[PDB]
Amino acid sequence: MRYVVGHKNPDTDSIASAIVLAYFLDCYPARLGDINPETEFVLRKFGVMEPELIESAKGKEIILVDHSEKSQSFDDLEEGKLIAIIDHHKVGLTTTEPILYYAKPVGSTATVIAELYFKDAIDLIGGKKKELKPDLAGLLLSAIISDTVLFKSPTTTDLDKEMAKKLAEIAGISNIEEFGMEILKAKSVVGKLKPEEIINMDFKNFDFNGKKVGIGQVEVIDVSEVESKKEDIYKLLEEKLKNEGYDLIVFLITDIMKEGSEALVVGNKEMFEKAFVEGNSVFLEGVMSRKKQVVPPLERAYNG
């Protein structure tokens, strides 16, 4: 009756935070979509099973992790009962009743959970005060690394590193740098998938001043792979744009090594141009984080 769920097109933070929190809250973990390769890698590595799929909150109690935007959560959230939101994004969700809300401007939701655990404050968000086994500690570690892109992303903070170090200990990972590289590789395999799989792997929806806007992403070590599919990708996006009523779609081809992204712009390029473009896209040096470096200047332009 009570579930912990991350956002649609869940990433590692959403799956790991849901699983670990469900453990401390003594309820059910779940996912609002399929898990990507990087997550499949981690769950398999630490021996944790994939959470059950959930698509409707109707008649259920829900704890949301890693997001606060209706567009990224249940469509029928109102028909269920929101219990809590543990996140690290800007406040985007409004509620009708008091809920347990805990957000911090850090690198991942796992970082937030972990800090509460080591600080002996898990009970502050309903946690039962149980031990954090190495398998779960491995999930949280992977979430931090996944979310911060091995501490290279500008959303990375001191708390993120400090927590990674501690979790790495309980998890038994001696070389975070190397384990992290393994994670960055699993993240990269997305490039070998079909264009449709690539776009729907990590796409997020936003509502900037009434205009539906989507921002997808791909994070690879070597962009060569995705670039050969770029044309087909950009094509499927133009279709998605018109067929699903988007006013704009930004697709980030993030090069992990150059720490910058090629931003494919679909739809209202004017707004994009006003927010930050020769033809297909443009490269944005140093841009890696959607939430930190792309959503803000974009929302600022739609309601300004």
Q: Which residues in this chain contact Mn ion in the complex, by CB under 5 A?
A: 11, 13-14, 66, 108-109, 147
Identity of the residue, 53 or 100, whose beta carbon is nearer to its own copies in the bound complex: 100
Q: What φ, ψ does residue 245 adopt, rounded to 5°? A: 60, 45
Tokens matching residue 304: 């300004």
- Binding letters toward its own copies, positions 77-116, x by CB under 8 A: -x------x--xxxxxxxxxxxxxxxxxxx--------xx
Q: What is the DSSP letter of 88?
A: S
Q: Is 121 in the site for its own copies (CB under 8 A)?
A: yes
Q: Does 211 bind its own copies (CB under 8 A)?
A: no
The answer to whether the CB of 190 falls within 8 A of the CB of 36 is yes
- Pick between residue 126 and residue 195 the one whose CB is nearest to its own copies: 126
Where helices occur in the chain by DSSP H, the ranges are: 12-25, 37-46, 109-118, 134-148, 158-171, 176-188, 195-199, 224-243, 269-275, 290-293, 295-302
193 touches 38 (CB < 8 A)? no
The least CB distance from residue 102 to its own copies, in Å, is 5
In 3D, which of 245, 187, 253 has the Cα closest to residue 214? 245
Question: How far is CA 175 from its chain centroid?
Answer: 24
When CB distances are held under 5 to 8 angstroms depending on the partner's kind, the choice from its own copies, Mn ion, none that residue 121 binds is its own copies
Binding mask 254-283 for its own copies (x = CB under 8 A): ------------------------------
Selection from Mn ion, its own copies, none that 164 binds (CB < 5 to 8 A by kind) is none
Partner that binds at residue 108, options its own copies, Mn ion, none, CB closer than 5 to 8 Å by kind: Mn ion
Cα angle for residues 236, 39, 204 (degrees, 5° grid): 40
Rounded to whole angstroms, what are the CA distances from 5 to 116, 130, 263?
19, 20, 29
Please say which residue, 279 or 304, places its beta carbon nearer to its own copies.
304
45 forms part of the interface with its own copies (CB under 8 A) = no
13 binds, among its own copies, Mn ion, none (CB under 5 to 8 A by kind): Mn ion
Chain residues binding its own copies by CB under 8 A are: 78, 85, 88-106, 115-116, 119-121, 124, 155, 291-292, 295-296, 299-300, 303-304
